[PDB]
Design an enzyme around this catalytic site. Structure first.
Site, PDB file in Angstrom:
ATOM      1  N   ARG A  34     107.569  79.489  -1.127  1.00 20.00           N
ATOM      2  CA  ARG A  34     106.226  79.122  -1.551  1.00 20.00           C
ATOM      3  C   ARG A  34     105.608  80.223  -2.407  1.00 20.00           C
ATOM      4  NH1 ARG A  34     100.291  77.824   0.849  1.00 20.00           N
ATOM      5  NH2 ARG A  34      99.974  75.873  -0.316  1.00 20.00           N
ATOM      6  N   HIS A  36     104.007  79.564  -6.014  1.00 18.79           N
ATOM      7  CA  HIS A  36     102.602  79.807  -6.331  1.00 18.79           C
ATOM      8  C   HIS A  36     102.393  80.875  -7.398  1.00 18.79           C
ATOM      9  CE1 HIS A  36     100.021  77.818  -2.952  1.00 18.79           C
ATOM     10  NE2 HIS A  36     100.876  76.976  -3.503  1.00 18.79           N
ATOM     11  N   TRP A  70     107.349  69.311   8.095  1.00 15.56           N
ATOM     12  CA  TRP A  70     107.748  68.065   7.442  1.00 15.56           C
ATOM     13  C   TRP A  70     109.072  67.608   8.033  1.00 15.56           C
ATOM     14  CZ3 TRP A  70     105.811  72.241   4.689  1.00 15.56           C
ATOM     15  CH2 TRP A  70     104.652  72.012   3.926  1.00 15.56           C
ATOM     16  N   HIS A 105     109.443  70.906   0.404  1.00 16.14           N
ATOM     17  CA  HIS A 105     108.711  70.765   1.651  1.00 16.14           C
ATOM     18  C   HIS A 105     109.649  70.452   2.803  1.00 16.14           C
ATOM     19  CE1 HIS A 105     104.379  70.200  -0.079  1.00 16.14           C
ATOM     20  NE2 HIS A 105     104.805  71.450  -0.104  1.00 16.14           N
TER      21      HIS A 105
HETATM   22  C1  HEM Z   1     101.162  68.608  -5.191  1.00 15.50           C
HETATM   23  C2  HEM Z   1     101.914  69.822  -4.921  1.00 15.50           C
HETATM   24  C3  HEM Z   1     101.901  70.578  -3.733  1.00 15.50           C
HETATM   25  C4  HEM Z   1     100.916  70.672  -2.803  1.00 15.50           C
HETATM   26  C5  HEM Z   1      99.565  69.962  -2.822  1.00 15.50           C
HETATM   27  C6  HEM Z   1     101.385  71.576  -1.778  1.00 15.50           C
HETATM   28  C7  HEM Z   1     100.683  71.913  -0.624  1.00 15.50           C
HETATM   29  C8  HEM Z   1     101.142  72.743   0.397  1.00 15.50           C
HETATM   30  C9  HEM Z   1     100.408  73.063   1.599  1.00 15.50           C
HETATM   31  C10 HEM Z   1      98.981  72.592   1.924  1.00 15.50           C
HETATM   32  C11 HEM Z   1     101.204  73.864   2.348  1.00 15.50           C
HETATM   33  C12 HEM Z   1     100.885  74.499   3.698  1.00 15.50           C
HETATM   34  C13 HEM Z   1     100.518  75.969   3.578  1.00 15.50           C
HETATM   35  C14 HEM Z   1     100.200  76.600   4.918  1.00 15.50           C
HETATM   36  O1  HEM Z   1      99.313  76.077   5.627  1.00 15.50           O
HETATM   37  O2  HEM Z   1     100.838  77.615   5.264  1.00 15.50           O
HETATM   38  C15 HEM Z   1     102.434  74.046   1.617  1.00 15.50           C
HETATM   39  C16 HEM Z   1     103.528  74.783   2.063  1.00 15.50           C
HETATM   40  C17 HEM Z   1     104.723  74.972   1.377  1.00 15.50           C
HETATM   41  N1  HEM Z   1     104.999  74.483   0.115  1.00 15.50           N
HETATM   42 FE1  HEM Z   1     103.895  73.116  -0.915  1.00 15.50          FE
HETATM   43  N2  HEM Z   1     102.648  72.029  -2.092  1.00 15.50           N
HETATM   44  C18 HEM Z   1     102.975  71.437  -3.295  1.00 15.50           C
HETATM   45  C19 HEM Z   1     104.151  71.678  -4.004  1.00 15.50           C
HETATM   46  C20 HEM Z   1     105.179  72.536  -3.620  1.00 15.50           C
HETATM   47  C21 HEM Z   1     106.294  72.911  -4.461  1.00 15.50           C
HETATM   48  C22 HEM Z   1     106.522  72.397  -5.876  1.00 15.50           C
HETATM   49  C23 HEM Z   1     107.021  73.833  -3.775  1.00 15.50           C
HETATM   50  C24 HEM Z   1     108.111  74.591  -4.231  1.00 15.50           C
HETATM   51  C25 HEM Z   1     109.150  74.140  -5.130  1.00 15.50           C
HETATM   52  C26 HEM Z   1     106.408  73.967  -2.473  1.00 15.50           C
HETATM   53  C27 HEM Z   1     106.899  74.745  -1.425  1.00 15.50           C
HETATM   54  C28 HEM Z   1     106.250  74.965  -0.211  1.00 15.50           C
HETATM   55  C29 HEM Z   1     106.830  75.631   0.934  1.00 15.50           C
HETATM   56  C30 HEM Z   1     108.256  76.187   1.036  1.00 15.50           C
HETATM   57  C31 HEM Z   1     105.895  75.622   1.915  1.00 15.50           C
HETATM   58  C32 HEM Z   1     106.061  76.178   3.343  1.00 15.50           C
HETATM   59  C33 HEM Z   1     105.476  77.579   3.482  1.00 15.50           C
HETATM   60  C34 HEM Z   1     105.579  78.129   4.896  1.00 15.50           C
HETATM   61  O3  HEM Z   1     106.200  77.471   5.756  1.00 15.50           O
HETATM   62  O4  HEM Z   1     105.037  79.228   5.145  1.00 15.50           O
HETATM   63  N3  HEM Z   1     105.222  73.262  -2.446  1.00 15.50           N
HETATM   64  N4  HEM Z   1     102.374  73.365   0.420  1.00 15.50           N
END
Ligand code: HEM
Ligand SMILES: [K+]
Length: 294
Positions: free
Chosen positions: A48, A52, A191, A175
């Site tokens: 992530r 970002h 997820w 995700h």
């Molecule tokens: C419409 C696009 C996206 C939205 C709205 C979104 C939203 C989110 C949200 C709300 C979280 C939770 C963060 C937390 O509470 O710790 C998250 C986690 C994460 N996202 Fe997404 N995301 C999007 C796209 C992506 C993309 C494109 C990637 C990477 C290619 C990605 C990879 C991750 C990963 C790996 C996590 C897990 C982080 C952890 O477990 O600490 N996301 N995202």
């Protein structure tokens, strides 16, 4: 202001061997610090972080992007959208200390590549050359996506990052890693059942689970399954939109195709905004610790 051109410049005298060493250091620490986030490990947060730090890019004026490594500055570091990423940055601190020669942008992006590969995901070709830029080049907050939106919002949002439908659906498959944390984003739950294994479970769950639109403890709506999984409204929009739906089905039924498409989209994401000279080294494909017998 006139759009800037960011030319990749290889860290002085460094080559494949040097970066494989950094990859190895990251991978070894990923293995060592396995207790983080209830034993999920730092893999997900590193992915992530790479996304970002790259996702702030705007194709219209080439501002933001992975090149500058601007997340190290407070404005971006404190972006509400980046809540929780401080954990990934702290994980990389000792790595940067051991290899002070690598740029911040290269480290942030390489951290994401290393995590995906070490979590059994596809190989992600990676190129070096990102150069640290001044604090005044830090993009303002608000360039990262909201999760309480629909398919139209997602489609439009990703056009700024020059991503089409297939690229968007493949990237969202990340995700399959980690989980949402109420205190970070106002959403809670994983997820998938295997948060530190990179596979196509995200798509299979979206299609096979019985989802219920509920409100979490932060008063936000999210889709929940009796299996203990969740989907953000933006994730669920992938099966609400007919064009996105077709692709979700494709990936849910072809693990290799998802791997190949994710690899391409992820590298593209990490390279947006960077101009690579014709004589720059070819992309590096790092061996995993497993492949090296380490
Ligand atoms: C419409 C696009 C996206 C939205 C709205 C979104 C939203 C989110 C949200 C709300 C979280 C939770 C963060 C937390 O509470 O710790 C998250 C986690 C994460 N996202 Fe997404 N995301 C999007 C796209 C992506 C993309 C494109 C990637 C990477 C290619 C990605 C990879 C991750 C990963 C790996 C996590 C897990 C982080 C952890 O477990 O600490 N996301 N995202
Ligand atoms: K998974």
């Amino acid at each position: 202001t006139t759009p800037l051109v960011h030319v990749a410049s290889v860290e002085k005298g460094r080559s494949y061997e040097d970066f494989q060493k950094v990859y190895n250091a990251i991978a070894l620490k990923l293995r060592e610090d396995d207790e983080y986030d209830n034993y999920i490990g730092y893999g997900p947060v590193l992915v992530r972080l790479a996304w970002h730090t790259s996702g702030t890019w705007d194709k219209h004026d080439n501002t933001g992007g992975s090149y500058g490594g601007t997340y190290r500055f407070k404005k971006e570091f404190n972006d509400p959208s980046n809540a929780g990423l401080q954990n990934g940055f702290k994980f990389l601190e000792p790595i940067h200390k051991e290899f002070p020669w690598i740029s911040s942008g290269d480290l942030f992006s390489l951290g994401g590549v290393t995590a995906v590969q070490e979590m059994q995901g596809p190989k992600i070709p990676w190129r070096c050359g990102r150069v640290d830029t001044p604090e005044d080049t830090t993009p303002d907050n608000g360039r990262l996506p909201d999760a309480d939106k629909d398919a139209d919002y997602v489609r439009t949002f990703f056009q700024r990052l020059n991503m089409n439908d297939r690229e968007v659906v493949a990237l969202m498959g990340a995700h399959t890693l980690g989980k949402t944390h109420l205190k970070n984003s106002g959403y809670e739950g994983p997820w998938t059942a295997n948060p530190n294994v990179f596979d196509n479970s995200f798509y299979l769950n979206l299609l096979n689970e019985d989802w219920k639109l509920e409100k979490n403890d932060a008063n936000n709506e999210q889709w929940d399954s009796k299996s203990g999984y969740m989907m953000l409204p933006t994730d669920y929009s992938l099966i609400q939109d007919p064009k996105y739906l077709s692709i979700v089905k494709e990936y849910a039924n072809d693990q290799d195709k998802f791997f190949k498409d994710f690899s391409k989209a992820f590298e593209k994401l990490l390279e947006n905004g960077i101009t690579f000279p014709k004589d720059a080294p070819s992309p590096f494909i790092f061996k995993t610790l497993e492949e090296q017998g380490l």
